[PDB]
């Protein structure tokens, strides 16, 4: 007997976007075909991670500078959900790049 509502909460992470977006699409499609109550795939400010460096390794030349960056997207979600179907959902449909974390909200 594992009927207790779990309030399970997922949080995604991805350097890129489309993999994260399709992962979220898969998670929501699985939850809805499983008849679950969800708080939608909320959108969080994609944290830009910036580093500005000098191009020249020696400092000679006109001052020229460049800005590398990533843009990380988190977009957590959360379900009012039982265990076994949901934990199985968590352990399925992961592609590389996207990192998934689960907290039970115990």
């Amino acid at each position: 007997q594992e009927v207790v509502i779990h309030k399970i909460r997922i949080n995604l992470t991805s350097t890129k976007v489309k993999q994260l977006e399709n992962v979220s699409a898969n998670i929501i499609k699985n939850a809805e075909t499983f008849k679950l109550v969800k708080k939608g795939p909320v959108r969080l400010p994609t944290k830009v991670l910036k580093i500005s460096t000098r191009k020249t390794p020696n400092g000679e030349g006109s001052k020229t500078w460049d800005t590398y960056e990533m843009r990380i997207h988190k977009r957590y979600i959360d379900l009012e959900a039982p265990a076994h179907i949901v934990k199985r959902i968590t352990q399925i449909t992961i592609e590389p790049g996207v990192d998934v974390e689960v907290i039970i909200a115990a």
Partner: protein
Amino acid sequence: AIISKKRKLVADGVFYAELNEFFTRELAEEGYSGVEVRVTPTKTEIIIRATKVQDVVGENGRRINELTLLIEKRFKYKRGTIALYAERVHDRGLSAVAQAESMKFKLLNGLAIRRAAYGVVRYVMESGAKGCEVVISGKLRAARAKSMKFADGFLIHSGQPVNDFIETATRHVLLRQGVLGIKVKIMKDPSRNTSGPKALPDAVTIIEPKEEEPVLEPSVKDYRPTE
């Protein structure tokens, strides 16, 4: 561990760089071409695209085995957490890195530079890519520095599609007189480019309209009524 998400992502990136430089250092003689890191909740698999798959595999699959332990020894991963997979490259012609390593190896044997480079570019054209370039700089048979370019087809230099299609590799070759820089640029065919745009930005494809005969002017028609 309890580590900020941004810090963890940077750590994953620098770990990716770890493995990439590792494989370039060691597996070069076996024809290393690229690395990928895929993670399941269970294990973190490392997928190693190489030219000569068996030599990377080694005798009776021993070689792969040792590499795994090195990783688990170097990066403190527990036994069985990470496994290694060897696959043949889809096609060695397209992967510029394999071509550049082939260049370096063929020079190591002391081959004709122009002959070797033209063999490489001909192989690239044979592989179906729509443009190749190989650049060699250094002490070409002399003391004064030189830099000759050997190109065919055509290559685009500017515009974000440069990253979208054109693969590029650079290698240093150790000859008795010093170091020779080789740069390989391969412009992948947009038609067969997965995971990205299927054509160049300015490639306009007009579609042929199907034709019909217009003589049927009056042509009263009737269907049977349907519920």
